[PDB]
Design brief:
Chain A: Keywords: Acetylation, Cytoplasm, Ribonucleoprotein, Ribosomal protein. Chain A: The modification N6-succinyllysine is found at residues 11, 53. Chain A: This is Small ribosomal subunit protein eS25. Chain A: It is found in: Cytoplasm. The structure is cut from a larger assembly and holds 9 protein chains of 9 kinds. With 144 residues, chain B is mainly α. In chain B, 47% of the residues lie in helices and 10% in strands. Chain B has one domain. The longest helix of chain B has 18 residues, at 124-141. With 127 residues, chain G is mainly α. Chain G has a domain at 10-75: Helicase, Ruva Protein, domain 3, CATH 1.10.8.50. Chain G has 5 helices and 2 strands, in the order E-E-H-H-H-H-H. In chain G, strands 1-2 form a two-stranded antiparallel sheet. In chain G, helix 4 packs across helix 5. The longest helix of chain G is centred in the C-terminal third of the chain and has 15 residues, at 100-114. The N and C termini of chain G lie far apart (53 Å). Chain H has 1 helix and no strands. Chain H is mostly helical. The N and C termini of chain H lie far apart (55 Å). The chains are: A alpha+beta (72), B mainly alpha (144), C mainly alpha (189), D alpha+beta (125), E alpha+beta (121), F mainly alpha (58), G mainly alpha (127), H mainly alpha (32), I alpha/beta (202). Chains in contact: A-C, A-G, B-D, B-G, C-D, C-I, D-H, E-F, E-G, E-I, F-I. Chains F and I meet through helix 1 and strand 1 of F and helix 7 and strand 6 of I. Strand 1 of chain F pairs antiparallel with strand 6 of chain I, so a sheet runs across the interface. Bound molecules: S-adenosyl-L-homocysteine. S-adenosyl-L-homocysteine (SAH) is lined by residues 9, 13, 31, 56-62, 77-79, 82, 99-101, 117-119, 122-123 of chain I. Chain B binds one RNA strand of 75 nucleotides through residues 11, 15, 32, 35-37, 39-40, 43-44, 47-48, 62, 65-66, 68-74, 76-77, 79-81, 83, 85-86, 89-91, 95-98, 100, 114, 117-119.
RNA sequence: UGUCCUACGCCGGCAGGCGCGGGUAACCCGUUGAACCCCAUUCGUGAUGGGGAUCGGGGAUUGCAAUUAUUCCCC
């Protein structure tokens, strides 16, 4: 029915993100938003933050689609 | 040997020239900078709060690429598509006062001057500054 | 070596089905840099068997009105689809593309005949050209009606449909519609 | 020594001048690698990639392009550069290189040297 | 009552030329473009109707075809009849009527005020 | 052209029913008054109910 | 980042509810009398980060933005940009927001009904 | 080619020739 | 171009088509006033309780209209997705899953009225080799004449794609003993031309 | 296509206003700097930043005259 995606990081959500996102083999805003039940703009912000800390590898950048994946 | 404006990426050049004109800080910023739409076909105010420096950088570049442009030419350049309600869309020009204020601010910085046959055109010293910032773009991009 | 998007090779591409070697044109003469060619592959009959198959996907994603004529958007879509399918699967994207094409084309169709009131269905065979065409159409429809109102983009849904039809798992749209068509053909011999 | 050729598309025209040089490519005074649509960038870059940068290392070209749209202009540009190199290696360089290069272009793509004569149809009352 | 923070007494005492700014853009453009001979004509007729009235009750009714008069504060209290195409509507000019046209107060059209087979055999 | 199309589509329907009738008798035992002359449509009357058609079954 | 300890899911301003789980520049538009343009200009005059979400504004921020929307002319918001420019009874420039919008609307309808012009009579004959 | 497209091509090539060949007050007095 | 050409009703009416049907405002509005016309087209007496069949019930909005008027009804359908979203709609009457052409499993002398909405057109064509539309229609119409009360009425709404379908349907109806006719609502219209085969047992 | 098309200068946020030039025309608008498209930002499945109808206030413009909203602009 009506989705109730979180607008901001909860504590358990942030911890689960930080220790379960960096092993997915495919990192896009859509997959994190759908399987973490979060708003996609904050999904993009979280992915940008994980890229900023040097832990996730960007593959290609676009205005339409951005894709990341694991370092190793 | 010196790289020109026409020798680099235009978007990075425009952003670097915007940073240049922002750090100079001597353009006459209008009092209505945060309360206007840039054309009648817009739907919101510009999302980048210091849009004036970006617009002035792009204006300077456009005069470099083609001289003799007045206010009407720059309103033609930044014109877009008005969605007329439930009625078919059309091409609409930009706002004249914003283009005029950009041109007069660039004249106040002495980068841009009039000519005898028409509108505004580039000064030699502003053209030196523009070649300098273009070389900075090429060094920051093509040598990296 | 000619490469799709500068990073995808067509030398290791092996086509499995004997039926379609002349009708899936991706080899050393059909290898192109980009799925855009401005080609007139439809001015004469059977010319579109010489069209490279990524150009056929690119030509078949320009559907439902708004997207007509927008081919650069579609070249972008299939490019991002190739990157994401390579990341998710770990091998050559073009290979599972031709795999999903082979596994998605129906082999036995039904035709509707009638005289007056009495309308019945007779099972008939399919041309290889129609096999490839229907596989392309069903995959494009699967991706398109797969996304349409969700957070997932068009490229992710296209790549997921392409994987799900490459391995032939029943969660794919194209293999479901193909199985339905083959079932009604078997019931209407 | 220099030659001047042209290529065309629906309405887009490209005029290419080919002179002895060192391997810099100018279109409308702008470099080849900076023309706006990157999605068609390899469509702009196919003659160089098929022939190698070593065949362009002793030549320079400048192309003026007028008419058409983005894609039509790109196709006219690639036709212009291919015809310019063919004309130059025909006139001032030996003919065997010109024939083998012409064969390479025409086996990869006929529209690199033969114009597509398709235009918009007229509507009659 | 007040109109744009101005009372009727000095509104009558205000000029013709700087009353213009108090009105809306349509009225201001009309007052820019002058008034015609019929306008001052019916102004004189309503003034004559006000002059010959006994001072206890309302004056007599002045009737006209002319639907594109703007109601000015001079006309407040007058008894005006406007032709709506077939009949005359008689209306008292209130102070609240201070901006509109006369033709708004006599509408020229009327409101529009606008079983299944069952088988027996 | 679409006029004659529709008109004799209706005429074929009527002819097929009229040819259904005699073998139906053997083996076993329409808005014309509501048609508008000015336009294609369906005009209401006061004496009769809303527009309809009754084709009885034999 | 993470949720602040004073994240307001529901805001109660101008006798109207605000959904706090949204950007501020549209949670402002959630009430009547303000759309996207006036919300953006109010927030730029108020010097508030528009990237920030609505639910994490402090009491000083909400009271100053409420203060600015009640008296926009004082904070150099221009005359032309306002909702009501010349009130008919008392000529002055303002911005009616929550209940004053409904007040001025229904009293304008009553004014058009009392004078028996075409517009008011037609509107009330429409129902 | 046809008239219009060839005309545009010819003028374009002429302008390119002149811009390749490219790369003070009027004489107000008669005698120096 | 038309749903009939999709194939058997068990395959065209899958879950996705059901979810597009339930979220469709035109379907709701038109099929609601068709249920109204169907219930008004049989002369069942006013203030008299009656028992009805609502075949081709699909969503049960026709059943919701029958229950709105106070009357009780039994739903019969072939697609499971239609019955799933109908029970999801919390309709009052009882549903049943079964093909109508094979025969309606009810005892004779049972129902005061029958209402069929957009379903009889599906029995005019054969989607299997074992299928034969003439005998299927004969069986289904004989099952109507069996399970109905003698003297009850059955309204049968349809949108015949040509006159051959009408020819075969009417022949199989008149050879099953049914007496009645055709109410062609708004005959010369196009967007409101709706065919209603009205039947009764004597 | 153009003696109403318009370059340019000044004012106003916009419609618009003022002045001064070209064009009876491949000569000036005009190298017709069109939109889709392309590249970055915000948005995140929400009758929601989709969609704009219908209204409230004000300004401007063409007309002898805009009321029953001529047309345009802002909220
Ligand atoms: N032979 C058959 N037996 C039973 N049901 C059938 C059938 N052929 C078609 N149907 C049914 O006819 C329906 C058409 S959809 C009708 C929906 C309904 N009128 C409403 O809107 O409430 C489907 O539910 C389908 O399953």
């Amino acid at each position: 029915d009506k989705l109730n995606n979180l607008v901001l990081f909860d504590k358990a959500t942030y911890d689960k993100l930080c220790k379960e996102v960096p092993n997915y083999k495919l990192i896009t805003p859509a997959v994190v938003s759908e399987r973490l039940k979060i708003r996609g703009s904050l999904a993009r912000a979280a992915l940008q933050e994980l890229l900023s800390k040097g832990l996730i590898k960007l593959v290609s950048k676009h205005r339409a689609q951005v894709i990341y994946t694991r370092n190793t | 040997p010196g790289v020109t404006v026409k020798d680099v990426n235009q978007q990075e050049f425009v952003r670097a020239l915007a940073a240049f004109l922002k750090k100079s800080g001597k353009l006459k910023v209008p009092e209505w900078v945060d309360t206007v739409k840039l054309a009648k076909h817009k739907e919101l105010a510009p999302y980048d709060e210091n849009w004036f420096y970006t617009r002035a950088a792009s204006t300077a570049r456009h005069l470099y690429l083609r001289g003799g442009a007045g206010v009407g030419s720059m309103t033609k350049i930044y014109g877009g598509r008005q969605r007329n309600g439930v009625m078919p869309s059309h091409f609409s020009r930009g706002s004249k006062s914003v283009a005029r204020r950009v041109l007069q601010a660039l004249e106040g910085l002495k980068m841009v001057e009039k000519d005898q046959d028409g509108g505004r055109k580039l000064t030699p010293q502003g053209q030196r500054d523009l070649d300098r910032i273009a070389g900075q773009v090429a060094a920051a991009n093509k040598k990296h | 070596d000619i490469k799709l998007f500068g990073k995808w090779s067509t030398d290791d591409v092996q086509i499995n089905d004997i039926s379609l070697q002349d009708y899936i044109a991706v080899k050393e003469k059909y290898a192109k840099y980009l799925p855009h060619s401005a080609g007139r592959y439809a001015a004469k009959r059977f010319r579109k068997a010489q069209c490279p198959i990524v150009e056929r996907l690119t030509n078949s994603m320009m559907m439902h009105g708004r997207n007509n004529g927008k081919k650069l958007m579609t070249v972008r879509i299939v490019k991002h689809a190739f990157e994401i399918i390579h990341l998710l699967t770990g091998e050559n994207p073009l290979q599972v593309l031709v795999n999903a094409i082979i596994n998605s084309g129906p082999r036995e169709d039904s035709t509707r005949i009638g005289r007056a009131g009495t309308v019945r269905r007779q099972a008939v065979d399919v041309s290889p050209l129609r096999r490839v065409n229907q596989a392309i159409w069903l995959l494009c429809t699967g991706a398109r009606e797969a996304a349409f109102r969700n957070i997932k983009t068009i490229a992710e849904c296209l790549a997921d449909e392409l994987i799900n039809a490459a391995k032939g798992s029943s969660n794919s749209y194209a293999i479901k519609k193909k199985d339905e068509l083959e079932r009604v053909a078997k019931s209407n011999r | 020594q220099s030659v001047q050729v042209f290529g065309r598309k629906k309405t887009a025209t490209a005029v290419a001048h080919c002179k002895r040089g060192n391997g810099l490519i100018k279109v409308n005074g702008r470099p080849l690698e900076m023309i706006e649509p990157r999605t068609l960038q390899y469509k702009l870059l196919e003659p160089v990639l098929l022939l190698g940068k070593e065949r362009f290392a002793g030549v320079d070209i400048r192309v003026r392009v007028k008419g058409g749209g983005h894609v039509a202009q790109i196709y006219a540009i690639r036709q212009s550069i291919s015809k310019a190199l063919v004309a130059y290696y025909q006139k001032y360089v030996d003919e065997a290189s010109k024939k083998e290069i012409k064969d390479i272009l025409i086996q990869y793509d006929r529209t690199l040297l033969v114009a597509d004569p398709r235009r918009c149809e007229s509507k009659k009352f | 009552f007040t109109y744009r923070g101005v009372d009727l007494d000095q509104l009558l005492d205000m000029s013709y030329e700087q009353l213009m700014q108090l009105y809306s853009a349509r009225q201001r453009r009309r007052l820019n473009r002058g008034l015609r001979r019929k306008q001052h004509s019916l102004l004189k007729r309503l003034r004559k109707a006000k002059k010959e009235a006994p001072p206890m009750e309302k004056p007599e009714v002045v009737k006209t075809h002319l639907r594109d008069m703007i109601i000015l504060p001079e006309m407040v209290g007058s008894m005006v009849g406007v032709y709506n195409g077939k009949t005359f509507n008689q209306v008292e000019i209130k102070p609240e009527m201070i901006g509109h046209y006369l033709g708004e107060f006599s509408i020229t059209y009327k409101p529009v005020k606008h079983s299944r087979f069952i088988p027996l055999k | 052209r679409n006029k004659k199309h529709q008109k004799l589509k209706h005429q074929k329907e009527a002819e097929e029913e009229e040819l259904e009738i005699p073998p139906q008798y053997q083996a076993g035992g329409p808005g014309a008054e509501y048609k508008a002359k000015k336009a294609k449509g369906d005009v209401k009357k006061k004496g009769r109910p809303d527009p309809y058609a009754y084709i009885p079954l034999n | 980042l993470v949720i602040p300890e004073k994240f307001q899911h529901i805001l109660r301003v101008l006798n109207t509810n605000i959904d706090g789980r949204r950007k501020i520049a549209f949670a402002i538009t959630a009430i009547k009398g303000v759309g996207r343009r006036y919300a953006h200009v109010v927030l730029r005059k108020a010097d508030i980060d528009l990237t920030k979400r609505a639910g994490e504004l402090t009491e000083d921020e909400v009271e100053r933005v409420i203060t600015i929307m009640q008296n926009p002319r004082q904070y150099k918001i221009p005359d032309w940009f306002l909702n009501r420019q010349k009130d008919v009874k008392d000529g002055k420039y303002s911005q009616v927001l929550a209940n004053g919008l409904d007040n001025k609307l229904r009293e304008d309808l009553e004014r058009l009904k009392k004078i028996r012009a075409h517009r008011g009579l037609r509107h009330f004959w429409g129902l | 080619v046809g008239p219009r497209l060839s005309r545009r091509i010819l003028q374009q090539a002429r302008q390119q020739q002149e811009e390749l060949e490219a790369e003070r007050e009027r004489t107000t007095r008669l005698g120096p | 171009r038309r749903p009939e050409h999709g194939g058997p009703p068990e395959l065209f009416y899958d879950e996705t088509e059901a979810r597009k049907y339930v979220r469709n405002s035109r379907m709701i509005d038109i099929q609601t006033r068709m249920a109204g016309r169907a219930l008004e087209l049989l002369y069942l007496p006013e203030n008299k309780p009656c028992y009805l069949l609502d075949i081709g019930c699909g969503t049960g909005l026709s059943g919701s209209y029958l229950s709105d008027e106070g009357h009780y009804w039994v739903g019969l359908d072939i697609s499971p997705a239609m019955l799933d979203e109908a029970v999801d709609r919390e309709i009052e009457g009882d549903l049943l899953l079964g093909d109508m052409g094979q025969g309606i499993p009810f005892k004779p002398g049972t129902f005061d009225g029958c209402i069929s909405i957009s379903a009889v057109q599906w029995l005019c064509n054969a989607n299997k080799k074992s299928e034969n539309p003439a005998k299927r229609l004969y069986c289904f119409f004989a099952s109507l004449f069996s399970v109905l009360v003698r003297g009850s009425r059955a309204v049968l709404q349809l949108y015949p794609e040509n006159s051959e379908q009408l020819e075969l349907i009417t022949t199989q109806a008149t050879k099953a003993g049914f007496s009645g006719g055709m109410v062609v609502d708004y005959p010369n219209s196009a967007k409101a031309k709706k065919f209603y085969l009205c039947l009764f047992s004597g």
